Design an enzyme around this catalytic site. Structure first.
Site, short mmCIF file in Angstrom:
data_model
loop_
_atom_site.label_atom_id
_atom_site.label_comp_id
_atom_site.label_asym_id
_atom_site.label_seq_id
_atom_site.Cartn_x
_atom_site.Cartn_y
_atom_site.Cartn_z
CB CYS A 140 81.29 77.58 81.26
SG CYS A 140 80.60 79.25 82.69
CG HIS A 187 77.88 76.85 78.90
ND1 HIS A 187 77.43 76.06 79.82
CD2 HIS A 187 78.17 77.43 79.90
CE1 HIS A 187 77.09 75.63 81.46
NE2 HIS A 187 77.96 76.73 80.75
CD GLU A 229 76.62 72.05 77.71
OE1 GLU A 229 76.98 71.25 78.25
OE2 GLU A 229 77.41 73.30 78.68
#
Ligand SMILES: Nc1nc2c(ncn2[C@@H]2O[C@H](COP(=O)(O)OP(=O)(O)OP(=O)(O)O)[C@@H](O)[C@H]2O)c(=O)[nH]1
Ligand SMILES: Nc1nc2c(ncn2[C@@H]2O[C@H](COP(=O)(O)OP(=O)(O)OP(=O)(O)O)[C@@H](O)[C@H]2O)c(=O)[nH]1
Ligand SMILES: Nc1nc2c(ncn2[C@@H]2O[C@H](COP(=O)(O)OP(=O)(O)OP(=O)(O)O)[C@@H](O)[C@H]2O)c(=O)[nH]1
Ligand SMILES: Nc1ncnc2c1ncn2[C@@H]1O[C@H](COP(=O)(O)OP(=O)(O)OP(=O)(O)O)[C@@H](O)[C@H]1O
Ligand SMILES: Nc1ncnc2c1ncn2[C@@H]1O[C@H](COP(=O)(O)OP(=O)(O)OP(=O)(O)O)[C@@H](O)[C@H]1O
Ligand SMILES: Nc1ncnc2c1ncn2[C@@H]1O[C@H](COP(=O)(O)OP(=O)(O)OP(=O)(O)O)[C@@H](O)[C@H]1O
Ligand SMILES: O=c1ccn([C@@H]2O[C@H](COP(=O)(O)OP(=O)(O)OP(=O)(O)O)[C@@H](O)[C@H]2O)c(=O)[nH]1
Ligand SMILES: O=c1ccn([C@@H]2O[C@H](COP(=O)(O)OP(=O)(O)OP(=O)(O)O)[C@@H](O)[C@H]2O)c(=O)[nH]1
Ligand SMILES: O=c1ccn([C@@H]2O[C@H](COP(=O)(O)OP(=O)(O)OP(=O)(O)O)[C@@H](O)[C@H]2O)c(=O)[nH]1
Ligand SMILES: N[C@@H](CCC(=O)O)C(=O)O
Ligand SMILES: N[C@@H](CCC(=O)O)C(=O)O
Ligand SMILES: N[C@@H](CCC(=O)O)C(=O)O
Ligand SMILES: [Mg+2]
Ligand SMILES: [Mg+2]
Ligand SMILES: [Mg+2]
Ligand SMILES: [Mg+2]
Ligand SMILES: [Mg+2]
Ligand SMILES: [Mg+2]
Ligand SMILES: [Mg+2]
Ligand SMILES: [Mg+2]
Ligand SMILES: [Mg+2]
Lengths: 556, 556, 556
Positions: free
Chosen positions: A399, A526, A528
């Site tokens: 990002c 994102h 994660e």
């Protein structure tokens, strides 16, 4: 339902979050349906304007509510999908009550803290604890965690509201665990109990009484100190738990479970847990906790970020790398590299540290460029992308790597020295990435594209697409407003850059993937936030594999 | 006068005693005359019945008042001779007030805590702070140290009495230092300020306000945490001191002095200290603090005692060995040997530990048998005396070695297997040491021969007598009731045993000194109570010298 | 400037407001320029939605901010014109801070109670205390009054903010008066000091220390209790004031002044008050306090209202009648008549009380119909207007009498039985009074015509116009939305009704005045808010005069 308040003892940072997630992942293994709430006594509607240094790694939920980090701890330990309303803050409560007062729903009455704020808090907790959090299963236990320490001025409304809750909700339906710290000063040489005693007394002066006391120390305390705690705090010597500093937090559920915090809870809340069946359910966690110790391979990854001073600014990134490294059966070894100790500006000021950081970046099997905000250290990320592009070293961008890599690619493969981001230099004639804030009420792309969206892969063989399992679309969580300039698209495409994944409009390129490089994926979302201990994230999995050089073998 | 209360923060054991002694040894270097008081909020008239494990090493004053250990800390840092009344305890105050009430000096009034107990406390402190403590010099500053932590139920009378004292005594004549602990949990990685904040708030809720805040941590805290303390506790950033865990406590005076706690005190109490002269007075302490670092010789001494589990049961012994080792310019290395892991009873149960302890005792340049009470481990001391007698290894006995060595000598050189102490075996026909409790009111020898007495040396060349400087008599502090049986005197004298020092009646042998052995002194008093950092004790000096084999050279 | 916090003791309702106004009217006589602030710890933006029973008689300021009642106490005692911002409430503070946070002026920080709410409170107090409140004179003292009692959960932010204020503002610029209650139980027979002791202790546990202690009792306490207070609360026996229940509150300024609360304040705040000149300034108050005792004429007025249960729902009305009665030199005697015990509905249920109330209304020299809200008891007001119209008895209507009298007049002089108010019966075909809510943003008449407006008198001889001094326009404070229907205007004008005063548009009739009746004025504004002890209000003055039958003589 049944509630478990988890208050906090001597300090903040003792382990309330891990203890609450462990309660959750125990009662979830025993068959129940658990939800969670985090109560932040700070006056902030949401963390959408926080800095990482304050509390660390602003999270992002599915609907688009930037929340605390414990809201991600809960998801990673329970595999649930929390909502915006699972995070109470003093600001939310006071704004709700003030709006109600102004509109007149308290018609002609003196709205005061007791009882109106505490009734708002209780109604909030009761209304949230029943929102289906995992599909359509109405929850059965709610782990409320009260942030901060007991005794603060900010957490008086909440302690009072729960003092009344424990009677409003039929005390057989309400536990309370008080996590406390037992220091062991090196000068003296014996663990001290006065802090826990004082904290328990201060908690009793507020009405509540600890049903458990989790004593968090550094090394295992003997039995003398357990007896001292039990006596001077008036709890049975079987409801005082000791949790020292374990290796990995996948050990905390098991360490509590072997101390009978399932038996005690099933006796105290009357949960009707079948122990003759609960045995072979907490098995994935034993497996994980053993794989945490039985890996010796030393894969080393580079994290070139800005806030690399407090080891919680990247909690999600680190816990998403560890999941992949454990799934590949290698042993992670993270190195934290500042992105500002990579520009010539420190070469002129501190060449020693300059060369040290550049060496650390050099001898590392992989590179990872996290996201972030601002202009500081933005050029160091360009330097790192350039190095990993000209040295054939795997790299992943989340990002902001998708920006700091297109910037590099353009600048050092088509010569547009003027390339930059509309944030960095607004007066640039070469704006490689331009904002898209055309919202004006939030219906267009416009403001920060928060929450989860749709990302479809364009046509063509792609390593990241194969990694995801070759689906047509995946939903990840964006926190970006900018975008690649749609007039440099072909200019960067007739080169070593590709564009595989995007949305339905096809004017938001969000997955770039260099050609010829072993692994140069960079994504606009994102990835994660969607990683789980038994289900790692495909981009991080690919990074680790291509870093230890097993990517093609895994693909086959 | 001028008073300096030194209250305590998060825990007990943080450093109140060392901080108070440092205040004392600074204001003493600047020319003033300092006294001290220790306030124990426990209900005990005196420590004369305490165990070493409770608080450690019951002290003994000149008049015979067994007191706390900080009462010895004060003496070792100020070279004063405190009295019985320099130790307030809740028991003393309440007994005084109750006796006054019964005798009617509160004629017809409701004696209550406020104001009668607190007026008793204030009158006690004011009457004691003016008792000439160093000859005939009326004191000028009084360092009152309040034991325990702020918030306890036992220390409410004292905090209230001082809340009133700070107004009764013209607040420009009253400071307050609040020693607090700043933990640094290894799991988090940042020093935490919430404990000190909470303790300061609890101290403000009692009226008092900290004029200083000494932040005791493990490693030096940065400036961020000093600013956080200063803000969240409302004190100027120059009246917050940081004292980490130094090497030796001879560094604490200097570490405070370089933080301007002389300037601040001379400004806050108006002491009229001449700084243009105070420079070259705190020099012996710089010398000592440097000799603490610049010694590399590794002299190793054996301490065969019973309570060798908490390293404060022998505080006086250890601090009297360190003084001698520093005066000889060698580096001490203490080994703590249990006296019960030396009998065959563990040979039958734990030969591993048996042999380990015996090896530790074997490879050690010197042996030291401390005092103590009871029968446990009394035979291990006999074993150690026998070993050091048949191996030509220096040994020193203090008030119980003089018993456990005569016992050995008799048993294993004249065959009286029946030899023992009237405590160990009352039905023995061979009582080598018999009690002397003929007091019935305390005027005879009788009860524990407490306090300082007279010890004259009999005639003959003696190493310990030469060590003392060959005087005729020395006054040490006895805490014994037993004595050598006066009918085995010649039986042990026509052998390798001598008798050099005794009292004026000559029926209390108190200094034995074997012949042929390099160093086998053993004394009936406690020579460790009279040691000072710039004036070590002659028996320990002789032990160290004969241990590193320099005794004769020092004598010449 | 210089601030005087006035906290509160055992209960709420002890006298904080009168004590604060007395401080104000003393420092105002001594020459200074005083302002005031009232701090309500309730979560309400303003009292614009309160009921009279809660705290009593919602006030109205010049700009249109419905505020507490102490905001009118201040005006009546100081002759100032306070503003909207002279009333802090927890709601105002929290909404301000939340808006700031959302807009980002706390850019990236954890907004918490300490320090952000308390800094907001301090900046509010400092910014308000300098707003010119009496023209262009910058204030010099600010009397902050903290509502509620010390110890409440709602008033923790404010006590903390002032604990920090007393140091931020150079303690020589900050006093503190603690008003407390000294009960005297009739069963025991001696005044008790434990409540004041406990309250003072609880106030000390919050940091603040009382510079004064005003002991409010029922009868004058002796000197024993003053000594007990001084001792057990640690204040000099000259800074403990005793204010018993006086006859009228015009005695409280003098009772404090004779206790040297001018001397003490000029010594403690360093005000530079010239006592050789302050003598002949507090003279109007001595005159008033004596006229309060030396009137014997017994003029009796009827107050036919709804909330006549707690004698604070009409505080403004009562204190505006007392001013006029004192200016005419008659002695007031108020009778409180419910307006619901005047309809046949109680004639069928309680004829005893019906006849009792009607008799009380019968034998009374004057009638007064206050304002109010709702439909309960609205017909009893019509009954009273009818009775006073057909019996030639003076009557005054304030903002609801102007409605309940036009209603009567129409119904019982033109036969329109359908006459009513759009609130009472929305489906009426005869709407004698219709709303005018055409605002939609507040610029038209629209919503409640709050604040002060312009009222010009139309042409013609009018008693009320002569009373005002025959000016062209007067500004009073309206709190109404309805209005007389502009199509019944001539229908009621060709009868015994008139229309003298109105606004500039001439479509808001607001002063009716019957013809032939001695006194039947009724006004649409609230003339009671502009009454002052040395300047009564013209409508109430006219009511009293025409009630005791001296109106024409006063006119001449
Ligand atoms: N700079 C910046 N921060 C934003 C913006 N929007 C939200 N934020 C958040 O606000 C925080 C600002 O607080 P700071 O403590 O100053 O963090 P910072 O701006 O990165 O400054 P440094 O930590 O010194 O790099 C950032 O960390 C972001 O998380 C934005 O548009 N610009
Ligand atoms: N045993 C014993 N202790 C005494 C006597 N007089 C005073 N004391 C004190 O009282 C304490 C007893 O407390 P304990 O905690 O039981 O210590 P202890 O007796 O040595 O027992 P252990 O520590 O297990 O060896 C001793 O340490 C002495 O300091 C005595 O006559 N006999
Ligand atoms: N009824 C009513 N009250 C209003 C309105 N607007 C503001 N208020 C205030 O809100 C208060 C309502 O609280 P209540 O305690 O119920 O007082 P009440 O409505 O007069 O009811 P009673 O006291 O029983 O007559 C009123 O006293 C007014 O001061 C309104 O439009 N209607
Ligand atoms: N028993 C443990 N062993 C090892 N590490 C732990 C343990 N408990 C917690 N930690 C680590 O300490 C860090 C801080 O813990 P945690 O987040 O639970 O603090 P907290 O009290 O929740 O903080 P806050 O209240 O501000 O959310 C976590 O990252 C966690 O990994
Ligand atoms: N700054 C320091 N550095 C290293 N050691 C220290 C320091 N301060 C204190 N110590 C050691 O810690 C031990 C305990 O300290 P101390 O006796 O002052 O605790 P205390 O608070 O006085 O305990 P108590 O209140 O029970 O008397 C002492 O033996 C001392 O040697
Ligand atoms: N000394 C006094 N003698 C006679 N009456 C008094 C005295 N002091 C106050 N009163 C009356 O008591 C009533 C209540 O007093 P006041 O309004 O000061 O209470 P308060 O503490 O201000 O209440 P709140 O805090 O709710 O505003 C007032 O109407 C006043 O007339
Ligand atoms: O120097 C002191 C310290 C403390 N005390 C008093 O004796 C008691 C000592 O008790 P402590 O406070 O020293 O330890 P604790 O057992 O209460 O808890 P931990 O620190 O081990 O976790 C307490 O009641 C104290 O008031 C003293 O008398 N002198
Ligand atoms: O998880 C949390 C913890 C704390 N808080 C609240 O935000 C603030 C965090 O402040 P902290 O209590 O976490 O740290 P501190 O700065 O006060 O002192 P040290 O520990 O560093 O020594 C506090 O006001 C707390 O109430 C949260 O909102 N969430
Ligand atoms: O019955 C009792 C009542 C009280 N007491 C105790 O003796 C003292 C009595 O003191 P009090 O509490 O009875 O009165 P006071 O002088 O403190 O204040 P006022 O009520 O007069 O305003 C207090 O210290 C109490 O604890 C008793 O011993 N017996
Ligand atoms: N400021 C950039 C960076 C986002 C990030 O990676 O954190 C954006 O909002 O798109
Ligand atoms: N009980 C022995 C031993 C004294 C000691 O050395 O402590 C005595 O009182 O004499
Ligand atoms: N409800 C009426 C009455 C006003 C009053 O007198 O209180 C109005 O708002 O006009
Ligand atoms: Mg913090
Ligand atoms: Mg947490
Ligand atoms: Mg910034
Ligand atoms: Mg202890
Ligand atoms: Mg001590
Ligand atoms: Mg014993
Ligand atoms: Mg009330
Ligand atoms: Mg008031
Ligand atoms: Mg109503």
């Amino acid at each position: 339902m049944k509630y478990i308040l988890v208050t906090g003892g001597v300090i903040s940072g003792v382990g309330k979050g891990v203890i609450a997630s462990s309660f959750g992942t125990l009662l979830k293994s025993c068959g129940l349906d658990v939800t969670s709430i985090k109560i932040d006594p700070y006056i902030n509607i949401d963390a959408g304007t926080f800095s990482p240094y304050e509390h660390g790694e602003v999270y992002v939920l599915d609907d688009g509510a930037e929340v605390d980090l414990d809201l991600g701890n809960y998801e990673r330990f329970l595999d649930v999908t929390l909502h915006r309303d699972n995070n109470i803050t003093t600001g939310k409560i006071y704004k709700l009550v003030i709006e109600k007062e102004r509109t007149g729903e308290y018609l002609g009455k003196t709205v005061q803290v007791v009882p109106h704020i505490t009734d708002a808090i209780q109604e909030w907790v009761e209304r949230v604890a029943q929102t289906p959090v995992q599909g359509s299963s109405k929850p059965q236990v709610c782990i409320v965690e009260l942030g901060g320490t007991i005794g603060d001025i900010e957490g008086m409304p909440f302690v009072e509201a729960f003092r009344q809750f424990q009677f409003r909700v039929k005390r057989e339906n309400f536990c309370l665990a008080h996590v406390s710290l037992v220091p062991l000063p090196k000068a003296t040489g014996e663990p001290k109990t006065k802090p826990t005693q004082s904290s328990v007394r201060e908690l009793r002066g507020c009405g509540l009484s600890p049903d458990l006391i989790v004593c968090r120390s550094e090394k295992p305390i003997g039995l003398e100190v357990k007896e001292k705690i039990s006596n001077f705090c008036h709890v049975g010597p079987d409801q005082v738990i000791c949790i020292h500093d374990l290796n990995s937090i996948y050990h905390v559920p098991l360490l509590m479970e072997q101390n009978g915090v399932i038996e005690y809870l099933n006796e105290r809340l009357q949960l009707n847990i079948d122990m003759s069946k609960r045995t072979k359910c907490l098995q994935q966690w034993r497996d994980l906790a053993r794989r945490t110790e039985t890996v010796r391979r030393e894969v080393c990854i580079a994290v070139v970020g800005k806030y690399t001073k407090f080891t919680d600014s990247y909690a999600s990134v680190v816990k998403a790398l560890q999941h992949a490294a454990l799934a590949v059966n290698r042993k992670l070894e993270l190195v934290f590299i500042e992105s500002c100790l990579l520009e010539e500006e420190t070469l002129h000021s501190e060449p020693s540290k300059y060369h040290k950081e550049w060496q650390k970046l050099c001898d590392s099997h992989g590179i990872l460029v996290p996201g972030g905000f601002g202009s500081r250290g933005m050029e160091g990320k360009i330097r790192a992308c350039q190095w990993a592009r000209e040295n054939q070293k795997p790299l992943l961008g989340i990002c902001l790597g998708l920006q700091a890599a297109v910037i590099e690619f353009a600048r050092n493969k088509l010569g547009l020295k003027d390339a930059n981001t509309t944030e960095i230099d607004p007066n640039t004639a070469n704006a490689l990435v331009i904002d898209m804030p055309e919202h004006h009420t939030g219906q267009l792309g416009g403001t920060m594209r928060l929450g989860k969206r749709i990302t479809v892969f364009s046509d063509g063989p792609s390593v990241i697409r194969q990694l995801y399992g070759n689906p047509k679309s995946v939903q990840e969580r964006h926190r970006h407003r900018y975008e690649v300039n749609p007039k440099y698209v072909h200019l960067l495409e007739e080169q070593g850059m590709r564009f595989v994944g995007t949305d339905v409009d096809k004017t938001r390129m969000e997955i770039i993937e260099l050609s010829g490089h072993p692994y140069f994926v960079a994504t606009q979302y994102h990835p994660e936030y969607l990683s789980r201990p038994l289900k790692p994230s495909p981009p991080f999995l690919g990074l680790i594999l291509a870093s230890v050089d097993r990517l093609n073998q895994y693909i086959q």
